[PDB]
C-alpha cells in the first residue's frame, strides 16, 4: 500500500521484530521492510535542482 518513488539502498538500521517502516522528525518515510526478504532498506529522494 505504501507508494512513492526514490532510490533504494542498504542501511545499518536495526528495526524491531514488529516494525514495518520508519519516519523522521518531519514525518517522511525513509525506510521500509521487505515482506519476503526482511531486509533493511532506506529510501532517498531522486536528484533535482
Amino acid at each position: 500500500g505504501l507508494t512513492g518513488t526514490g532510490v533504494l539502498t542498504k542501511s545499518n538500521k536495526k528495526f524491531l521484530p514488529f516494525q514495518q517502516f520508519g519516519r523522521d522528525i518531519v514525518d517522511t518515510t525513509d525506510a521500509v521492510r521487505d515482506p519476503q526478504t526482511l531486509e533493511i532498506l532506506d529510501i532517498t529522494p531522486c536528484s533535482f535542482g
Binding site: 514488529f18 516494525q19 514495518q20 517502516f21 520508519g22 519516519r23
Partner: peptide
C-alpha cells in the same frame, strides 16, 4: 458450587508509571 475465596481490598498505590505501550509501528 460458588468458591468465592477472594475479597476486595479497594487498596491502591501512587508509584506505578507502568501503563505505557506502543501505539503504532513507526
Amino acid at each position: 458450587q460458588c468458591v468465592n475465596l477472594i475479597t476486595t481490598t479497594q487498596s491502591y498505590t501512587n508509584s506505578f508509571t507502568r501503563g505505557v505501550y506502543y501505539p503504532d509501528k513507526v
